[PDB]
Amino acid sequence: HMRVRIYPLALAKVVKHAASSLQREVAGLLVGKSAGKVLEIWDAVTGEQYGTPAYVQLDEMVMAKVAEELSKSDKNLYIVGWYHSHPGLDVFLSPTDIDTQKRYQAMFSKAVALVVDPVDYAKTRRISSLKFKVFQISKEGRVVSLPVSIGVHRAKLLESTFHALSTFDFMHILGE
Amino acid sequence: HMRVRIYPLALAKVVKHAASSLQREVAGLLVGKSAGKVLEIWDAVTGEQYGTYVQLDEMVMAKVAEELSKSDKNLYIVGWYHSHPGLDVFLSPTDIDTQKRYQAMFSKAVALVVDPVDYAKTRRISSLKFKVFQISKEGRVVSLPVSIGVHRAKLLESTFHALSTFDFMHILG
Ligand SMILES: [Zn+2]
Ligand SMILES: [Zn+2]
């Protein structure tokens, strides 16, 4: 099965997003690149930041805007999938999620769906309580859970952290 | 010489703060913990976030310390950072006096000095220009060996924490 490597700030952003809002399902886009046979996840962007607080995984206009912006980044990054939370429901793809993931794979064969259920992590504050999986649909149409590692290659760790920090939609007050 | 292990989000926050002010020196606090003989830097926080020359501000440092204390990640103030845009990376006479005062309070305290100009221009990691210093028993300024922290569990813990402390209401402009 394809290995997935997630750099730590991408995962932190997913988790913070999911755990921040336990009474609803949140979603966003995964940003990264292939590294030989491994799919690397460098960043995660919320639907909210692009104006879509629910179901941004289905929002083609947002995907095109994110893709156009990455067109400039010059780290050679692209959309690699989508994420969403399932608070209190555990981690799986629903029938609708499967259809969404099939469409993602049509546009990029290595696309993945990260599903997180942050409830236990919110309760214990231990990262070990996190429940998440990264899925693809197999060629036989089966949902498969992929092996996930944390990315630690030092140069890419630095680059990915600097990138993911730069895209975090921090709260701010503008000067006039 | 003491090894310094800096987790990547802490570095990134220092550099982002420094690169946001290319026409003036900025400063902040380093947060971390000792891991045997190694000093770990887990986070870097600005004075602004606590109301702040923050490296000299004992009221802020006490507030930062109190708050770190109540959370149980066993993190502490372990030094200070500041930028020298366009001037390269050294400790000035004034910085040396500041650093001596830090080491009086915590023997492993360090001074990170960053010159963000090349990084601001290229956005390449290879353009980073920074050093981490202590003052020796003889009064010499020692540049310490620096590694990037990659231990998987601490890398996650430090990243999740440093993101949490970044996410405040920034007053810009
Ligand atoms: Zn779902
Ligand atoms: Zn200085």
Author numbering:
A (entry chain A): 0 to 175
B (entry chain B): 0 to 51, 54 to 174
Provide excerpts from the study.
Using these constructs, we obtained crystals for full-length CsRpn11 and truncated CsRpn11Δ149–202, for which we collected data to 1.65 Å and 1.35 Å resolution. The CsRpn11 structure could be solved by molecular replacement using the Rpn11 coordinates from a Saccharomyces cerevisiae Rpn8–Rpn11 heterodimer. However, while the latter is assembled in an antiparallel fashion, the CsRpn11 homodimer is parallel, with an interface formed by the first and the fourth alpha-helix, H1 and H4, of CsRpn11. Notably, based on static light-scattering (SEC-MALS) measurements, CsRpn11 appears to be monomeric in solution. In both, the conformation is different from the eukaryotic one, but both obstruct the catalytic groove in a similar fashion, suggesting a conserved function of this insertion.
The first complete archaeal Ub modifier system, including E2 and E3 enzymes, was discovered in 2011 in Candidatus Caldiarchaeum subterraneum. C. subterraneum Ub (CsUb), E1, E2, and E3 are organized in a single operon, adjacent to a second E3 protein and a JAMM protease (CsRpn11) with high sequence similarity to eukaryotic Rpn119. Our bioinformatic, structural, and biochemical results reveal unique features of the archaeal proteins, but also remarkable conceptual similarities with their eukaryotic counterparts.
